[PDB]
Amino acid sequence: MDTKKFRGSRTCGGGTHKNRRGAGNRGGRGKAGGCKHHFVRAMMRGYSYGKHGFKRPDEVSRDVSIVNVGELDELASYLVEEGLAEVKDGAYHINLENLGIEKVLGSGRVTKNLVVTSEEFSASAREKIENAGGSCIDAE
């Protein structure tokens, strides 16, 4: 706190000089007082007691990266500019495994012709891709 603000105040913003003794003016040390006298604060902070669910090992689980069709469509010109994509006979041939994306979602609009190869496709993503005349290949 601002020490110079309190030169000549005695109590230094604490009230009586009987406050600020030690751990008993805080109710215990740490998150102490779980549900006897700090129960309401315990519930509001996000420290409620309980155990709920299980965990799978991290060896087997994976966290897929995603990209929506709108995002993939809008930045296609920049992708071919960087040499990532390819523009043979007009339709963009864009491969998602060189970027680092394992699944294509479907939020947004698609207007350009896209030939997208990847591992996974939501149903709506495939519907939107092929309603614009494009094609999707399950990359293996």
Next chain:
Amino acid sequence: MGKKSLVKLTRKTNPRIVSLILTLKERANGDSAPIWKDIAKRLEAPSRNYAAVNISKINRHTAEDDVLLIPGKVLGAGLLDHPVTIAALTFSDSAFEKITEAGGKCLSLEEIMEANPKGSGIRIFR
């Protein structure tokens, strides 16, 4: 401009903002146009809560050949379809390239206040 606005002015450090605020109030008195006084009171707000406008919002709301005052920074995210004039406080480089490719202009607040004395048709964005 009581002591309140003087305090809010004293907090600022960047000289260009201070010069803008003073000149905007002067020009507002000169032309009797509340637009400049409004922009001054906006620029005099907390710096945490300024405006950051993406290209998509301008494309969504404006029309062909509008004039725009953005007391903040224009960010480049989206696609710009039609020519627009966006006189803002600052542009990012991608935003500048997109607006130039579309065929618009990117002129600072000084240029817009000098060219148009009254703001007869300016649209404030946020």
Next chain:
RNA sequence: UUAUGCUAUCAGGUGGAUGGCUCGGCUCAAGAGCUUAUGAAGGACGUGCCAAGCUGCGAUAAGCCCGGGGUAGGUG
């Protein structure tokens, strides 16, 4: 000439604050890093012309011999 006293200032005593100075302390960094039965570190006692303490030294006892550097004084 009102004594014993009270208040304020001045001169002096006692005292050792303040200021100025400081071969000391502390912290960080870069180096360097074992020694002793061929008797170590540490201790007791002694050792000076006048010498009590500390420092050095050991009955050859604030010391002896050789090689280099240094140059006119030396005797912690």
Next chain:
RNA sequence: CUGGGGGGCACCAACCUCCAAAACUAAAUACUCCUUGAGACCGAUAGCGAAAUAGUAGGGUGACCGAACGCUGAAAAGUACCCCGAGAAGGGAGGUGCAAAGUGCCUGAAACCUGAUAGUGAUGGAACGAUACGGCAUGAAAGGAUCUCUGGCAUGAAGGAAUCAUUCGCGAGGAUGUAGUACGAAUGUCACUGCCAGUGUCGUAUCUUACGUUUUGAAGAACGGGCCAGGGAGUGUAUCUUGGUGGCAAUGGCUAACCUUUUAUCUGGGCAGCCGAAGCGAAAGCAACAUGUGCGCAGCCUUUUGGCGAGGCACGACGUAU
């Protein structure tokens, strides 16, 4: 060896991978008795306990605890000779030195003690003082000279009489007129004068039963302080949350260890990694509006009444869990 082990519960099968129960091995790293360098470090009650005759004096049977003490001057030039005194004490006179700085000797505060000066004082009542008026003492510098003192004239806000006359009342007195007059804080102006401001102490009038704290309540017969000087109390690392000011900005932001260091700075590299970008669900898993409608502030246009209306609010639609 046609063998054996492992692949996060046991066994079977496939696949992948290794060869224990013997042994050695530089460099990158840790530390500071010690040597060198540097310092937004302390400056003698501080900094190590020790500016070291300091682990000493001293204290304890012992394990062990543990202080205080810096400074003449440029040069000792460290007070010759004379008088007093019992004097190798000490004093006086007289010298040295820019200056006594006269030996633990730079400067030399306060408490405390001795003397002098001013006020007061042996008929007198107390939180030791604040305010106004007087006596006595001082008032050189740094404070005043249309300033100090005494008067005249002009304007004067709120307020505002005395005196006399008429009239009412049992009476104390009231009302009207004289009169909103004569005066009135102050504001200007013309003469007059040499003091005033300030400081000490005493007297008169009004007021006040100290200060910090605990207390519903303190002058308390509640606690603390004899006095003076010095010392003496919200600081750093990690992490979470939130303001004021900034850089960059979905083609996002920042680098960490380290290398280039030419001595700790600095310039340029360093994409490992962290946060943001998609959520829901215990999990398997699945995977959304890049605007469909309305009300409307600011601002702009306008017949000053309406219109457009970013942000804001309210809907509608969709992802997932149940």
Next chain:
RNA sequence: AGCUUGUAGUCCGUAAGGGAGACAACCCAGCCCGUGGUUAAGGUCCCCAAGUGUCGACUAAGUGUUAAUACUAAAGGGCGU
């Protein structure tokens, strides 16, 4: 019971200044500094600023001379007036 526990308003706590003999919380008043003026509460014999004030009666006990109040005596009687 100056006791204990409730409730409405206002206060002390944290509230100067004026008046009550002194009075945490009772009456007037809620307060920046300086000067002039008129009033509030309360008072006007002296202490003490301003009435030995006016009109009509009562008391003879120094009764009384004490807004509220934790500080002020009752039943009963009197051919006292």
Next chain:
RNA sequence: UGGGGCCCCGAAAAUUGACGGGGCUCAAGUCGACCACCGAUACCACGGAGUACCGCAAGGUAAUCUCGUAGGAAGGCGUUG
């Protein structure tokens, strides 16, 4: 005979003593009225400071701003480098 005002008896406590004290009797007491004056920092006037809000500034408005403990916020002074 009944209803009222004042007073008397009923009425005894320990240091000396409390209408605040002196004292007060057609009152300096009690009851019902009345007149004049005194008396705050209240209210009025003048000058000055600060604050709140507005205004580009100059400046403008304040009967509807000026108490304060725990405590929140803003601007300044000082010590060493």
Next chain:
RNA sequence: AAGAGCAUAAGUCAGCCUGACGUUAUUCAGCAUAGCAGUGGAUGACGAGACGAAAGUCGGCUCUAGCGAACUUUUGAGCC
């Protein structure tokens, strides 16, 4: 228990039945105003029924008491 409610009835008797049902959302009081479990009580929604010509009534016994978090074990349906 105490208080409140009830007459072609919320009381007495007879006939027929099991709504003393599975799942789920708000609002009220516990806990005026003004945060606080679990858990209860009033309106509803989905799926099945009983009685009755139908309207309707039925989420026990006219209304307000008869009860307990996390962790742990056991049991039921289906999944990870």
